Every structure is written in C-alpha cells, then in structure tokens.
Design a binder for this molecule. Sequence first.
Ligand SMILES: N#Cc1cccc(C(=O)NS(=O)(=O)OC[C@H]2O[C@@H](n3cnc4c(N)ncnc43)[C@H](O)[C@@H]2O)c1
Length: 521
Amino acid sequence: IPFTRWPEEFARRYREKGYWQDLPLTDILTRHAASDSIAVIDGERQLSYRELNQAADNLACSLRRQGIKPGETALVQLGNVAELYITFFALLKLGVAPVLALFSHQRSELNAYASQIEPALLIADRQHALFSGDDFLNTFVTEHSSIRVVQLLNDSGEHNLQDAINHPAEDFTATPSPADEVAYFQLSGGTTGTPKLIPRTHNDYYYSVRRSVEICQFTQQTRYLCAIPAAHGYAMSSPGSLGVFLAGGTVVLAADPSATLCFPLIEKHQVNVTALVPPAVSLWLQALIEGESRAQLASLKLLQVGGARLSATLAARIPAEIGCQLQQVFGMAEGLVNYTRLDDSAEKIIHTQGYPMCPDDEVWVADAEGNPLPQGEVGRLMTRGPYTFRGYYKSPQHNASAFDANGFYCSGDLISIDPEGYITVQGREKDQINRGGEKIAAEEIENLLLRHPAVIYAALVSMEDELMGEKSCAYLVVKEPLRAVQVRRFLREQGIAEFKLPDRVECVDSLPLVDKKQLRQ
Ligand SMILES: N#Cc1cccc(C(=O)NS(=O)(=O)OC[C@H]2O[C@@H](n3cnc4c(N)ncnc43)[C@H](O)[C@@H]2O)c1
C-alpha cells in the first residue's frame, strides 16, 4: 500500500525519542484481552474487553475464510455502534486498511472513497437509506468490482455482519501490517473537488493516541461519551475511543450530541469526559437554561471542545454553567493536535487553542510567499512531526501543493502564537466551510452546482451564524428562475451528505470572475 514515508533521519530520531514504538494498533485492545471490565456501552449492550477482542478475532477469521487478504483495503460505514470498533480491530488484525466513512455520507462520497482505494470489502448498515434495499448495492458493487465481500449490519439475509462476529474463530492468528506501514486511511476536511485520503501508519497513529492519553490523564476510571460521529479522528484518537481502550476505560456511545440523548447517558453511566463541537456546547447550555437539571452532569470532569473555534464568551460559561473543566482541542486529520493542558491557567484555556501534543511537533507561521513571521504575527500554519503525514494517498498533483520543499504541511489555517508558545486560530485560507465543526469543500459543491442546467456561475461561501459559527450560502448566476428547494433537491439527487446542502441560496445578476475575496466585499 503506497504512501509517503518519512525521511530516514526523521524515522530514526522519532524511534530514538520513543515516539514510534513499532507496535501494531491491535495491541491497544489485546493488552486487555483477558479483562472482563466494560469497554463499550451501546444502549442496553455492554461489551467487555475480553468479548470485544473475541468479536474482532471472530470477524477477522470469518473475513479471512471469505478470502480477504493482508494488504487489501476496505470501505466501512458504521455510525455510533459497537460494531464500529469490532470492525476496526478485526481489519487491523488482518492487515487490511479501511476508510471509515461517516454514517451521514452518501453516494458521491462513498463512490469517491471506493474509487481511490479499490476495496475488497464493504461493510455497511441496512439502517442507512442506501442499504435498506439492494438496488444501490447492485450498482455500487458493479461500479467498484474490486469488492468481493459485503457484510451488513441489521441484515438477516446471507450478508449478516453479526453471523460473522458471532462465529467463534477456530485457529486464528493475526497478521497486522508492519508498524511502519499503513494501518488505515483518514478523511481530510476537504479543500478540493475530490476527497483526499490520509494514510496513517501504526507507529504514527498509536503515538498520537498514547500521547493524548498522557495529556488527558485517561485511566481505567475514564468513562467517555462518544456522541459526535465516532469514526472522525477527534472522536477516535484525540484521545478518543482508542485512547479510552488503551487506558482500559469505558466508551459510552450515543447516536448524536443532543442533550435529550446525552444528559441521561451521562447521569446513568457516570460519564466523566466527553467531546463536543461548539454548537453542541451552546445547545447544552441552553438546555440547562430551559430547565434541565445541572445535576445530571455532576460526574462530568472534563469537556473537550474542538473542530471549530470556541469563542471565549462560550468557553467561560463551561466551568461556570456546567462545572467541569474545559480542554480546547485544535486538531486535524492530517496530524497535528494542539491541546490546552489540564494544569493550564484559566487565561490559556479560555482564549487559546493550546499547543502541540509532541515536543517535536514543529510549528511555524508563514507569510504569503513562504517566509517565517515573528511571534504575535498572523499567518499560515506550517507543520511537521512524528504523527503528521507526508502525503495524501495517490495524489501527486495535490501533494506538490500541500507541502513545502522541506516536508512542512500547510494546514490552510491562519494562526498567531503567544509569547508563552500557545496557538490562537485567527482565520482561514483554504476554500472550506466549517459548519459547526463539519467540513465542506466549497469547490466540491460548486462543481455539483454547475451541473445544474440553469446555473452558469456558482460560488459557495460561509456566512456568520450564531449557533453553527458558519452556515453555507450558494451564490448563483442563472439562466432562469431557481428556488433554493430546487438546488437542494438537485444536490440531494447527486447524492451528498445533508450537512453539505447550502443553508441559503441567492440568485444574483452577476458574479466577479469566481473571485470570492471580492464577493465578500
Ligand atoms: N485526528 C484529529 C482531530 C482532533 C480535533 C479536531 C479535528 C478536526 O476538526 N479535524 S478536521 O480534519 O475535521 O479538520 C481540521 C480543521 O478544523 C479546524 N479546527 C479544528 N479545531 C479547531 C479549533 N479548535 N479552533 C479552530 N479551528 C479548528 C482547522 O481549520 C483545522 O485545519 C481533528
């Protein structure tokens, strides 16, 4: 599986400092293989570590019997269900590298992922609108003929994922890829018209999980609510569910971040940490204002907020109105995660996005032509380190743009750094809408819009929104009358996730040639 390696002097240093341990990610689970403490709670279901590891082995073995092999790829689409984790570990034990699509993703996104990775295996959920029947499956499996095996959650037919999980593995031995090779693919936010995949090696991903565990002080006492989409990296690894498993704690799954679902799960299971994006935080606080008892949240000790910038106003209200500590998390799937620390001053927790997890994360701020700027100045985030990738999968053209000559990645973010060394996020250069933490590549949607018979020119831009931070607005130059609902129905036909439909559509008599900077004025 081809990916961009670190230069040999970097690998060598990162091993010498102990960052790269050359253990597979399977070891996060197998170190607890003999434990009957609870690893996952999913509704009424409670899975121990012993059971979780046995389930992954059963699934792996079963897939192996069906002919799936090490070095192959898989496409997986599961939401906040225990079978996400079983599946992730089963594929790791086989040496098969998955993309974990979010439940919300639709035809265009799944098609794009499958086209790039040519998966031998598809795992999905009949609860998803695409997979309740067999029509789409038929089309999908025809247009991506690399697929040999299909397993489905909530199926009772011959493709029942549960039959595999429940089938005791006879004589199974795990064959994870080497630790310095690819374990799985993460998804980028998106800055371009086609999705970009981020190869993650065992060494590099395990380090980001293990170091996050130290910073967040997770142990067997950790009871972690995973309520945002579980397969996103913030939920998975910062420290996320994998950090919880590493530390032997418990992950409580919720279908979404609503107060209605989560206030009860927090009280019931005595959750002590969770992870939110800013709007979820406002909604929780407003739920408390509307009368939910604050006592349902007593057990909560740490709340992480990330994905988009938390305002200081909103941040301050957390210890006050909820009574736990805040941790700001400013991370990206490409690598680099900055944390405020548990012993930081209130000033740093409230006003900054923290600093890098690793002492050898190298972060500098560039001006427009690639030159360093002194501290305090606002500029482009440039970075490299032991868990930051060196290239998107099979994307030479785009890789040429995304990295400088020395291997620094440019995250498309504008930042400034404190005298004390802390990062504040000040704006953005990449052509991307951050809608309450979820990422929308404007060019992707603009390309889809131009496919409309009536649309001559298309621009997608973010607009301030109090709750969501940013909402999306499509500016169109049209041949003919065109209402928002027509655009939205059309896009939905193309098959994209709901969160990517424009919140707002305006037909305009003209647009500048599209010069978005000028449009903002
Ligand atoms: N592995 C991982 C991980 C951990 C926490 C958050 C994220 C994340 O949001 N990743 S992303 O791949 O969906 O996109 C990252 C982009 O989110 C933005 N971001 C993210 N956290 C902030 C922030 N705290 N303030 C302001 N902008 C932010 C920033 O633009 C960054 O480049 C990923």
